[PDB]
Design an enzyme around this catalytic site. Sequence first.
Site, PDB file in Angstrom:
ATOM      1  NE  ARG A   1      -6.384  -1.491  -0.330  1.00 12.93           N
ATOM      2  CZ  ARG A   1      -7.229  -2.317   0.280  1.00 12.93           C
ATOM      3  NH1 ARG A   1      -7.027  -3.627   0.241  1.00 12.93           N
ATOM      4  NH2 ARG A   1      -8.281  -1.832   0.927  1.00 12.93           N
TER       5      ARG A   1
ATOM      6  CE  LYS B   1     -10.267  -0.730  -2.558  1.00 13.41           C
ATOM      7  NZ  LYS B   1     -10.641  -0.354  -1.169  1.00 13.41           N
TER       8      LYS B   1
ATOM      9  CG  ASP C   1     -11.293  14.931   4.695  1.00 14.23           C
ATOM     10  OD1 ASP C   1     -10.077  14.893   4.972  1.00 14.23           O
ATOM     11  OD2 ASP C   1     -11.829  14.162   3.867  1.00 14.23           O
TER      12      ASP C   1
ATOM     13  CG  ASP D   1      -7.777   9.099  -1.553  1.00 13.51           C
ATOM     14  OD1 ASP D   1      -7.681  10.339  -1.438  1.00 13.51           O
ATOM     15  OD2 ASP D   1      -8.142   8.372  -0.608  1.00 13.51           O
TER      16      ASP D   1
ATOM     17  CG  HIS E   1      -8.966  13.459   1.632  1.00 13.99           C
ATOM     18  ND1 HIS E   1      -9.891  12.888   2.477  1.00 13.99           N
ATOM     19  CD2 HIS E   1      -8.327  12.430   1.023  1.00 13.99           C
ATOM     20  CE1 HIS E   1      -9.825  11.571   2.376  1.00 13.99           C
ATOM     21  NE2 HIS E   1      -8.882  11.267   1.502  1.00 13.99           N
TER      22      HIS E   1
ATOM     23  CB  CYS F   1      -4.930  11.606   0.952  1.00 14.77           C
ATOM     24  SG  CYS F   1      -5.278   9.826   1.015  1.00 14.77           S
ATOM     25  CE1 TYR F   2      -3.627   6.466   0.117  1.00 18.37           C
ATOM     26  CE2 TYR F   2      -5.119   6.028  -1.700  1.00 18.37           C
ATOM     27  CZ  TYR F   2      -4.742   5.834  -0.387  1.00 18.37           C
ATOM     28  OH  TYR F   2      -5.479   5.010   0.433  1.00 18.37           O
TER      29      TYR F   2
ATOM     30  CG  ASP G   1     -11.094   9.913  -1.703  1.00 14.44           C
ATOM     31  OD1 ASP G   1     -10.538   9.695  -2.800  1.00 14.44           O
ATOM     32  OD2 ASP G   1     -11.562   8.986  -1.002  1.00 14.44           O
TER      33      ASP G   1
ATOM     34  CG  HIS H   1      -2.103   0.918   1.076  1.00 16.26           C
ATOM     35  ND1 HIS H   1      -1.993   2.291   1.131  1.00 16.26           N
ATOM     36  CD2 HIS H   1      -3.412   0.652   0.859  1.00 16.26           C
ATOM     37  CE1 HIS H   1      -3.186   2.832   0.961  1.00 16.26           C
ATOM     38  NE2 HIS H   1      -4.066   1.860   0.796  1.00 16.26           N
TER      39      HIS H   1
END
Lengths: 335, 446
Positions: B291, B294, B357, B297, B360, B299-300, B350, B243
């Site tokens: 990962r 999936k 939020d 996002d 994020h 935040c990645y 996200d 991850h």
Amino acid sequence: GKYSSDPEWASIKPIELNDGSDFGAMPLATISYSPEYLEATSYLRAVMAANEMSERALRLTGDIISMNPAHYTVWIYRAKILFALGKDLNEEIEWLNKVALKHLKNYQIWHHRQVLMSSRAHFPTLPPREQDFLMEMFAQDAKSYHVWTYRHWLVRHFKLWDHPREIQDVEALLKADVRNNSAWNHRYMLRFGPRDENEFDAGLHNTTGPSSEKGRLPVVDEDLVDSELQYSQSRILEAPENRSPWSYARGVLQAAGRPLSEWKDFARSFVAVKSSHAIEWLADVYAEEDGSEGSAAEAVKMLTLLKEKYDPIRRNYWEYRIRQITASAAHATEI
Amino acid sequence: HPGIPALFREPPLIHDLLSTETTELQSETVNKCLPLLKGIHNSQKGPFNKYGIPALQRKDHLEYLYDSLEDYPASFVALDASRPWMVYWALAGLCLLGEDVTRFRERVISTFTAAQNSTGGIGGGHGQMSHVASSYAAVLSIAMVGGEEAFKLIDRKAMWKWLGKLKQPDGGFTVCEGGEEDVRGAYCAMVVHALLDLPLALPPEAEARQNGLETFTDGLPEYLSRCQTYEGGISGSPGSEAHGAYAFCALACLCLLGRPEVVVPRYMNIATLLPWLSARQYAPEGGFSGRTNKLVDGCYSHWVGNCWPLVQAALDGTQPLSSVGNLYSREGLTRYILSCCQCKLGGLRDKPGKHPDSYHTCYALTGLSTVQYYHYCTDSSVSSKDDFSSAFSWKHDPNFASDGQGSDIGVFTENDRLVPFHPIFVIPHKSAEDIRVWFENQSFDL
Ligand SMILES: Cn1cncc1[C@@](N)(c1ccc(Cl)cc1)c1ccc2c(c1)c(-c1cccc(Cl)c1)cc(=O)n2C
Ligand SMILES: CC(C)=CCC/C(C)=C/CC/C(C)=C/COP(=O)(O)OP(=O)(O)O
Ligand SMILES: [K+]
Ligand SMILES: [Zn+2]
């Protein structure tokens, strides 16, 4: 208040919240807690301060958990009480199941489960419906990272690598969604993960050796390797653009100490391209395992197809590979 | 807009016939992103640059972040154990956008005074046990606001003793006493350890000493090595799934142990790590997934995005006072953040369809900042010692906004430029420097 009027709690005085909203400047990111949560947590501070191990404190942890299951402190304190009082952990597990079903995304619940289940005195063997409960979770979210993590621990703890329900549950999940990478990862652990109980847990064999050889099995079951590779090909044929089985196959070949060229013809059958993973596979075969002339040029052709058509967002990586291959071929021509 | 390449306006070429839940979710995500990538969604504000990308809505995000530092209703009780995180995410976002957060010194002190336990460490709030993540958040927050008074708040010796209790025989760290052991724990623990200049030796009565361990770093890179998977990525604990989040924690932790070009190739197989990290990025979305199979996002943009300067340093080596360059698409990431992750009322998200939020918001901005700079390690450290020496030798040069097309271009405008963040410490370089240097010059408490 509930607790402040209960004779059960009369013997102890709660510790009021001190957030710094009286001293100095005003604190940041405050939460206007409900009166119920304020009171419960004020009593929790009191029992934890006194290190109280009691039935009333246990009920309190359950109450706070019902309001806020992401309260890490209360779970740890709850576990302390359960062991200190010699509570029936079978009953605790049955209660925990209900909490887990209400809060699918909560991971604290699953560390707690591991803490309880690790107790050999209470759970000498795998409970008869434990694997079934895990499938009830996976039926709701098949990729739940924390449930998969727990299942890995469960397999190692009860030595379930060859337990038929582990492989059966993986295959049921891969039938439902062949692209479930979490199921593929668990399958690798069952088949090729390190099992030596006298060693620290690891995702790969041979972590004591050179990093390039990480994953290499000390002893190779050749029939098992063949069977796993055949299984991988069969799943690939169902959806060739699915990355997971291709990555799994690379992992199996690395573990077995076999070259990627074992799948050369298989990869070529998808090339009119039905899989970019087949292209990347061939690139590596021609570049790293083929020492004949012209093989370097073919690898560069494959990487060019990837960077221009089949996976262009990764252009800078493909080009890095091209530069590596060019330098290598130049060194070969040099000598 | 003619400045938007087809790569970001169409689904991928290869499409399997078989439909599963994975492809249903992936398809829905692509479909939500497409009108935003194209810049034709009515929720989007301009101006749009020559690449067809909306401006970073700085004023909207500033207002969002400032509001996020105030009071929340009772429904936010789930965040009670994560209040220090909320302070950090907001301060980080404000710093990134160029605000002076010095004026928050007193309020930061007031917040964390109550959350610090007398036995050591910082928890989620009054009465909560110490936790490495809340200590990490508190330390970074203290670093950003600066000042001797904020620095003095931390009981260094107590923190050292408590962190010593978390050291496990397998070399890793639990997040709190009785809590889970994962690489997030190891990373948070070592950052706190580095920034406060705690002693390298374990406390003389630490339990881990009965297991042959002598220092906080003993057995640690070996533990991290055992978290690499067959995929090439790094999992939260051994045997779990690779991850991006844990890849960052592991790589950042390794780079706290020595020079990237020494430690990373020694403990990680870079030959498998590199393509897995590369494979995190999707088109047309442009952003990173955590990962395999999936979804992207925002935040990645940090968790995966900031793996890149670390890996690239491992390949380039220490720069004295030639590079492999960027091995991912900066254009793609920037398009995902600016076109898809901006909420019209402020804050970042996200993905489309999610509310914003502060978590994020913080990490999407952190990722946007990383594409705007060349981050590299040098032979010049601000540390007067040798422990974590490489970690304090990181420097930065701006990667200026580009013109025309290319494989490695800056498609943000210079008006969108954020403050640079340290790739390991995730705060401004000067903030990390100042706190480390201050503690280095303080004698350890008796
Ligand atoms: C997996 N993830 C990806 N994006 C956000 C999430 C998360 N599921 C998550 C869960 C655990 C952890 Cl350690 C890190 C992230 C997430 C999702 C929404 C989040 C929060 C976290 C958190 C949060 C809470 C505590 C720890 C951290 Cl690192 C993040 C805060 C918040 O306001 N919201 C909306
Ligand atoms: C320092 C810091 C706390 C490090 C950790 C941060 C990171 C985000 C933690 C979570 C990683 C993992 C468990 C996500 C899975 O959830 P998911 O299934 O909802 O997300 P996914 O689909 O993207 O994998
Ligand atoms: K956390
Ligand atoms: Zn996220």
